[PDB]
Design a protein around this ligand. Structure first.
Ligand SMILES: Nc1ncnc2c1ncn2[C@@H]1O[C@H](COP(=O)(O)OP(=O)(O)NP(=O)(O)O)[C@@H](O)[C@H]1O
Ligand SMILES: [Fe+3]
Ligand SMILES: [Fe+3]
Length: 903
DNA sequence: AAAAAAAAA
C-alpha cells in the first residue's frame, strides 16, 4: 500500500498547517546520518560499529534507519486525533483509554514489525532497537510482555487499515536509508549512546525555523521518488544546522610538550616525566592518574596527556570537570587560550557548564559573525551542554550522566566522544565517589580515555577509581581472589592504565628517580592547647601570644576556624584588641552576599597572593576564614593557625604557608623563622574530646585519629612532599590511632550511609544493562543529587522601615522591585544578575520548615528560573537608622556588613 | 554548626 500523507508529527507553532509524519521521520533519519559522519568523534564511530560487528558505513545506515523509526508510535488514533483529521478511510483501533505516550507505542510496535525486514524475531538486537527508540524522550520502558500468539493485537494494533500505514512508513524509511541489513550484535551501553544520537537528531530537526522551511517544499504524494527527494534535500540542509549550534569538532594537531607550551622555558619535572614516558604507553583507551602538589604545572601536564589519549582513541572532544563553579570559570579561560594557540573555528563552542553560567556576561550570548569558541544559543539550552565539542564545568555535570534521571543517555552520548579530565579528585567525598566510580565504569566500557588529577590521594580511593575503569573496559567485575590494581600511590607520581590488557604502569617502573618538584622548606606543625569555656574555645590568650610578633615587626597570617560562628568570634576579638592603634583585619566565609564575597576575595589575594608580591602591594595583616581557604585561593601567609581538622584537610590548608618562597621575591619578618602551621586543640581532662560544633562538621573519630597521629610525631616537622601521602594514608589506615571504638564505628557507619544512598541513585553497572536499558531511567516514589546532604538555598535580605516598606539597602533608598524592568514588567537576564549578586547561600535546616508568606518572593518573581526559588529574609530598620535582628523561620537574622549574615 | 553543586522537541 502506497503511503498516506494525512498523518502528521508536528502541528504546534506551525501557524495552522501540519508537517507530515513521513517528513519528520525522513528528516530525523537524515540528521542522524549526518551526525554520524560529521559530528561523531572517529573513535566513537569505531566503538559503535564494533559492538554491532559490521563496518562503519553499514553501522551508519542502520543508525539512520533506526532514527527514522523514532516517532512511528505517532501513527495511532490516540495520537492522530489530537487535532482535526479525516480518518474515515481508517476504521478500527477505537480509543482504549490507556493514554499511552507515542514513544511507548514505538517500543511496543517495533519488536513485531522489525522481523519482517530481517530482524531476528525475539532477538536481542530487535529487543534493544525497539527499547532504545522507545526511549527517545529521555525515559526507557520495559521490554514488552505478552501472553498471546498475536502481540501486535495484544498491544492495541488491531486494525488492518492502520497496520498497513505503519508498515508503509516502516518501508519508506527502510528504503530511503538504503535498506540496511540487521546488525548481528548490539549491547546495552552501545544502545544507550545511540539513543542519545537519535535524540539529538530529533531535536535538531524539530526547530521551528527548520520546519517552516521544509514546510515550503512538502512532497506531492507518498511515492518512493517523492520521499527519496525529501530525504536527500534534508540530507543537504543538516550540516548547516550543526554550525548554527556550534557542534563542529575542535581538532588539535599532534605536538610535543614544548610546541604546545612555547611560552614555557623550563618544563617541570612532572611535565618532563609525563611527556617522555607517555606517548609510548598511550596506544589506545586508558586512564592516567597524576597526583602532585600545588604549583607543579598539573594543568599543562593534563592538556598534554589529554592530547595524547585523544589522538590514541580518535577522540577530539574534551570535558574538564572542576570541583567548583569558580575554578571552572578560570579553567574555561585557560583552555580557551590553549585552544586559540593550538588550532590553526567559528562553528564550535567551548562551552562553560554549571548552573550560574547563564548569569556570566562574558560567556552567555546577549552567525558566521561569531567569535571563535563562543557559546551558541542552542548549547545554552537544558541538557545540551555536554554535546559541545569542548567544555569545562563542574564535575556534577558529568556525574549527572550516571544518575537515574531523564535524558541521561543524552549526557552519556555527549561524553562518549570526548577525553574526560577530572581535576581535584581528592576533593570528592564518599557519595560523589560512588557516582565517579559508576561514571568511570561506564566511560571505560565506552572506550573513553580519562585523566585523573589530584593532590594526594588515599590509596583506596585511587584503587577504587582505576578498578572501576578497568571493570568497564574488561566486561567483568573484580573477584574476591583477584589482586588489587593499585596498592600504593606516590606523591608526586603518575600512573598509566591500559584498557585493552589492564596493565598498570607506575611512574616508578619507568624511572627509578623521584619526580623533581619545587624544593621547599619542611612545614613545622605545632599542637597548642586552648582552654575550653562553655564547651567552646577561648582562643583569646593564645591568639594574643601567637600574633604578637606580627603587630611589632609585621607580616601576614591566617586563622582558620571550623565554623562561621567561631570565625565571626575571632574577628570581633581581633578588632577589639586592635582598636589600640596597621595591622589589617579580614574575614572570609560563605555567608556574604556574592558581590561582597567576590570583592573581599579579590583584595585578599591582592595582598597575600603572587601578583601582590610581584607588584609590591604585599603589606607589613591578618586573615580570619572558614574552610573557603581550602578552595583555590592564591594566598601566601607567613604563619597559619588552624582548628584541628582531618590531616588531609590540615595539610591542604597548610599549603598556603610560604606558597611562593621559591620565588625569592618575598621578605619574611624576623619572627617567621620557618614555615609554620599552628594547630589548635582543646585541652582535655581517655579518648580526645572536641567541641560539638566541630564534631558536627568532621566525624569525631577523624579528628581524634588526626590529633593522635600529630601528637605521635613529637614536634617533628613535615618534610614536603616526602612525608605527606603517608600521613594521608595513615590517618585512615592505622587502627591504633582511634581509641574511641564507638566514635570510630559511627564514622564508618556514616560513610556506609553515604555510599548506600549513592548506589540507589546511580544507573546499573554496564553488564547489568547488557540486554535491558530500562534501569537507566527507572525510579519511583523529586530530583536525584550529585552531592550528599540537605544542601543550600539562596536567600535575599530585604529591608523594612517603621512605615513600613520594602527596600534593598539599610538606607532605604532602593525600592524592593515587585516587578522587573523589562517590557511587560518581566525580568531580564541583567535584572536577575543584579539580584543574584547580593544573594547569600544558607545551609538547609529546620528554619526552612517554618517559613511564611513574607519569606516567599512576589508573584512576578515566580516566572523567573533564577528568582522563583529565592527565600526572602526581612530586616527591620529603626527610624534612627539602626538595623535590627529579625525573626524568620524560628530564629533571628542580621546581615552585618563586616561579619556577614548572622543567625 | 563547612564547603561545595543543583522546558523540549
Ligand atoms: N614551567 C612551568 N610549567 C608549568 N606552569 C608554569 C611554568 N612556569 C610558569 N608556569 C605558570 O605557573 C602558573 C601557576 O602554576 P600552577 O602549577 O598551575 O599552580 P596553581 O595554579 O596554583 N595549582 P594548579 O592550577 O592546580 O596547577 C600557571 O599560570 C603556569 O602557566
Ligand atoms: Fe517523539
Ligand atoms: Fe520526533
Amino acid at each position: 500500500p502506497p503511503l498516506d500523507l494525512r498523518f502528521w508529527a508536528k502541528e504546534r507553532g506551525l501557524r495552522g498547517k501540519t508537517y507530515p509524519l513521513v517528513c519528520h521521520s525522513l528528516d530525523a533519519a537524515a540528521a542522524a546520518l549526518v551526525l554520524w559522519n560529521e559530528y561523531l568523534s572517529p573513535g566513537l564511530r569505531d566503538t559503535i560499529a564494533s559492538s554491532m560487528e559490521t563496518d562503519e558505513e553499514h553501522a551508519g545506515h542502520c543508525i539512520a534507519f533506526w532514527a527514522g523509526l523514532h516517532d512511528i508510535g505517532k501513527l495511532t488514533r490516540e495520537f492522530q486525533q489530537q487535532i482535526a483529521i479525516d480518518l474515515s478511510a481508517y476504521p478500527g483501533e477505537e480509543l482504549s483509554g490507556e493514554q499511552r505516550s507515542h514513544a511507548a507505542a514505538t517500543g511496543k510496535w517495533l519488536p513485531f514489525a522489525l522481523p519482517s525486514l530481517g530482524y531476528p524475531n525475539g532477538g536481542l538486537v530487535t529487543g534493544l532497537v525497539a527499547q532504545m527508540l522507545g526511549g527517545h524522550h529521555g525515559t526507557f520502558h520495559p521490554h514488552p510482555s505478552f501472553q498471546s500468539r498475536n502481540p501486535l493485537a495484544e498491544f492495541g494494533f488491531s486494525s488492518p487499515h492502520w497496520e498497513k500505514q505503519r508498515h508503509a512508513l516502516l518501508h519508506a524509511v527502510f528504503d530511503a536509508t538504503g535498506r540496511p541489513t540487521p546488525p548481528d550484535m548490539l549491547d546495552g551501553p552501545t544502545a544507550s549512546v545511540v539513543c542519545g544520537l537519535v535524540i539529538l537528531a530529533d531535536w535538531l530537526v524539530s526547530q521551528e525555523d527548520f520546519l517552516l522551511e521544509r514546510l515550503t517544499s512538502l512532497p506531492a504524494d507518498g511515492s518512493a521518488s517523492a520521499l527519496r527527494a525529501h530525504f536527500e534535500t534534508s540530507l543537504r540542509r543538516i550540516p548547516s544546522l550543526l554550525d548554527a549550534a556550534g557542534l563542529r569538532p575542535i581538532t588539535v594537531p599532534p605536538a610535543t610538550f614544548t610546541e604546545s607550551f612555547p611560552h614555557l622555558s623550563k618544563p617541570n619535572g612532572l611535565q618532563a616525566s609525563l611527556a617522555k614516558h607517555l606517548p609510548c604507553l598511550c596506544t589506545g583507551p586508558g586512564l592516567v592518574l597524576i597526583t602532585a602538589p600545588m604549583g607543579e604545572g598539573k594543568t599543562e601536564a593534563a592538556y598534554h596527556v589529554a592530547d595524547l589519549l585523544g589522538k590514541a582513541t580518535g577522540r577530539p572532544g574534551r570535558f574538564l570537570a572542576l570541583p567548583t563553579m569558580a575554578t571552572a570559570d578560570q579553567m574555561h579561560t585557560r583552555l580557551k587560550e590553549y585552544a586559540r594557540y593550538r588550532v590553526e573555528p567559528r562553528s564550535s563552542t567551548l562551552a562553560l557548564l554549571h548552573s550560574m553560567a547563564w548569569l556570566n556576561p562574558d560567556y552567555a550570548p546577549a552567525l558566521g559573525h561569531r567569535d571563535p569558541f563562543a557559546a551558541t544559543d542552542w548549547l545554552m539550552g537544558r541538557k545540551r551542554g555536554l554535546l559541545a565539542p569542548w567544555a569545562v564545568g563542574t564535575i556534577d555535570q558529568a556525574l549527572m550522566a550516571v544518575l537515574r534521571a531523564k535524558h541521561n543517555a543524552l549526557r552519556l552520548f555527549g561524553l562518549a566522544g570526548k577525553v574526560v579530565v577530572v581535576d581535584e579528585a581528592h576533593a570528592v567525598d564518599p557519595y560523589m565517589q560512588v557516582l565517579l566510580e559508576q561514571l568511570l565504569r561506564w566511560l571505560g566500557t565506552l572506550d573513553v580515555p580519562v585523566v585523573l588529577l589530584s593532590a594526594t590521594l588515599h590509596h583506596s580511593i585511587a584503587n577504587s577509581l582505576v578498578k572501576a575503569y578497568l571493570e568497564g573496559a574488561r566486561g567483568r567485575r573484580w573477584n574476591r581472589s583477584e589482586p588489587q590494581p593499585v596498592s600504593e600511590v606516590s606523591y608526586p607520581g603518575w600512573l598509566h592504565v591500559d584498557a585493552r590488557i589492564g596493565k598498570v604502569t607506575r611512574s616508578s617502573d619507568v624511572d627509578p628517580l623521584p619526580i623533581a618538584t619545587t624544593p621547599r622548606k619542611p612545614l613545622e606543625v605545632r599542637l597548642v592547647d586552648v582552654p575550653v569555656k562553655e564547651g567552646a574555645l577561648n582562643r583569646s590568650t593564645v591568639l594574643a601570644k601567637e600574633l604578637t610578633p606580627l603587630v611589632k615587626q609585621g607580616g601576614c597570617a591566617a586563622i582558620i576556624c571550623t565554623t562561621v560562628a567561631e570565625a565571626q568570634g575571632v574577628y570581633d576579638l581581633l578588632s577589639q584588641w586592635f582598636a589600640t592603634l596597621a595591622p589589617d583585619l579580614y574575614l572570609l566565609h560563605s555567608r556574604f552576599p556574592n558581590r561582597q564575597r567576590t570583592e573581599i576575595t579579590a583584595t585578599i589575594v591582592d595582598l597575600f597572593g603572587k601578583e601582590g608580591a610581584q607588584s609590591g602591594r604585599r603589606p607589613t595583616a591578618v586573615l580570619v576564614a572558614t574552610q573557603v581557604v581550602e578552595q583555590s585561593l592564591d594566598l601566601d601567609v607567613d604563619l597559619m593557625i588552624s582548628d584541628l581538622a582531618p590531616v588531609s584537610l590540615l595539610l591542604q590548608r597548610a599549603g598556603r604557608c610560604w606558597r611562593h618562597e621559591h620565588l625569592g621575591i618575598i621578605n619574611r619578618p624576623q619572627w617567621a623563622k620557618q614555615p609554620e602551621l599552628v594547630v589548635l586543640t582543646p585541652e582535655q581532662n581517655r579518648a580526645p574530646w572536641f567541641p560539638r560544633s566541630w564534631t558536627s562538621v568532621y566525624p569525631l573519630a577523624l579528628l581524634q585519629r588526626t590529633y593522635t597521629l600529630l601528637r605521635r610525631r613529637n614536634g617533628a616537622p613535615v618534610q614536603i612532599p616526602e612525608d605527606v601521602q603517608q600521613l594521608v594514608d595513615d590517618v585512615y589506615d592505622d587502627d591504633s590511632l582511634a581509641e574511641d571504638l564507638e566514635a570510630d564505628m559511627e564514622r564508618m557507619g556514616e560513610e556506609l550511609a553515604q555510599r548506600g544512598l549513592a548506589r540507589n541513585a546511580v544507573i546499573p553497572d554496564p553488564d547489568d544493562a547488557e540486554d535491558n536499558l530500562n534501569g537507566l531511567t527507572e525510579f519511583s516514589f523529586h530530583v536525584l543529587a550529585t552531592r550528599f546532604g540537605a544542601g543550600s538555598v539562596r536567600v535575599l535580605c530585604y529591608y523594612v522601615d517603621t512605615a513600613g516598606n520594602r527596600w534593598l539597602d539599610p538606607e532605604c533608598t532602593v525600592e524592593f522591585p515587585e516587578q522587573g524592568t523589562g517590557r511587560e514588567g518581566r525580568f531580564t537576564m541583567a535584572d536577575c544578575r543584579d539580584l543574584v549578586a547580593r544573594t547569600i547561600p544558607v545551609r538547609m535546616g529546620p528554619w526552612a520548615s517554618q517559613l511564611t508568606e513574607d519569606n516567599h518572593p512576589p508573584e512576578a518573581w515566580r516566572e523567573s528560573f533564577y528568582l522563583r526559588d529565592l527565600v526572602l529574609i526581612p530586616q527591620r530598620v529603626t527610624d534612627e537608622g539602626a538595623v535590627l535582628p529579625t525573626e524568620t523561620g524560628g530564629r533571628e537574622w542580621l546581615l552585618d556588613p563586616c561579619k556577614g549574615l548572622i543567625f
